[PDB]
Design a protein around this ligand. Sequence first.
Ligand code: HEM
Ligand code: HEM
Ligand code: ZN
Ligand code: ZN
Ligand code: ZN
Ligand code: ZN
Length: 270
Amino acid sequence: GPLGSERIVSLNGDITEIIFALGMGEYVVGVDSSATYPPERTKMLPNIGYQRRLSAEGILSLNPTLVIGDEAAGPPETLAQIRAAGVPLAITADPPSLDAPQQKIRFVAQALGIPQRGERLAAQVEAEIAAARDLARRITNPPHVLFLYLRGTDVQQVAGRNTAVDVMIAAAGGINAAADAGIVEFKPLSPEVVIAAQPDVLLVLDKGLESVGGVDGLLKIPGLADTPAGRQRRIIALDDLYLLGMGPRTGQALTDLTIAFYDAAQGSRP
Ligand code: HEM
Ligand code: HEM
Ligand SMILES: [Zn+2]
Ligand SMILES: [Zn+2]
Ligand SMILES: [Zn+2]
Ligand SMILES: [Zn+2]
């Protein structure tokens, strides 16, 4: 008979999104800084710190019955205090792979004792990813795409291979132009990178684009105005959790990218 009441502290924005997508959001009592979806619900919840800089006291003072996160959660010394306090904790992998959404969904569903709801969500996410990949197969002339991580004019980084964004670009039928500059993971933007990449599409984050003054500011960054992207103002700005979370909205984000890439394939050059 007896029913306990679950008090979940979720350590990562993408895990939080998945708890809410499974229908269990009312049991979440604490979230990290990156947990911006669904924004109306997560803005109301106590903050336990950023996912990689978690407060042990911020988590434990919420008296959780369960703490759940994935490999981005840290530091290790905070996880260790959770264990030493005797609070149930589980952590899952989060590889840069189109299999990560399904794996994280099954992980959360099992912890919450709803494996059937989890199979239903994973099957839908996989169907949405399938549909975007089918649209991406229409691209026979794939555009060169450069992802820029921006944090004002001071910080300008490009993402190469072994990143979630690299996986998203390729599955949406685009070419990650950071390979042409040799880039693995995150590396600084440079005159040399821009010459070698000459992207057709500039892919950025919402906040990043705001932090440089919008499209007008971005194209004041040396070299960018004169790329094929810069010339046609072909800038795609997406929310960070949406583009890079590898969560339930992965198929929706792939569809937005591939639609944009298809247009660039037709219109960027000559
Ligand atoms: C692609 C993955 C990443 C995303 C989505 C991301 C996102 C963010 C966001 C949303 C902020 C706060 C808003 C702002 O800066 O205006 C931020 C700040 C920051 N990011 Fe990142 N970032 C990423 C990767 C990195 C990496 C790899 C580093 C370090 C090597 C880094 C270092 C920082 C620092 C130092 C701040 C400023 C913290 C503060 O001022 O309080 N970021 N980032
Ligand atoms: C969905 C993807 C991501 C989102 C939404 C996100 C969000 C944010 C936010 C809001 C901050 C500011 C936190 C603060 O200043 O206290 C931040 C900082 C940071 N992020 Fe991320 N992040 C993401 C992925 C990543 C990745 C992939 C890395 C590294 C590979 C990374 C490493 C960092 C680092 C080093 C900071 C500076 C804060 C610290 O050192 O504790 N993040 N992120
Ligand atoms: Zn339980
Ligand atoms: Zn994650
Ligand atoms: Zn190339
Ligand atoms: Zn859409």
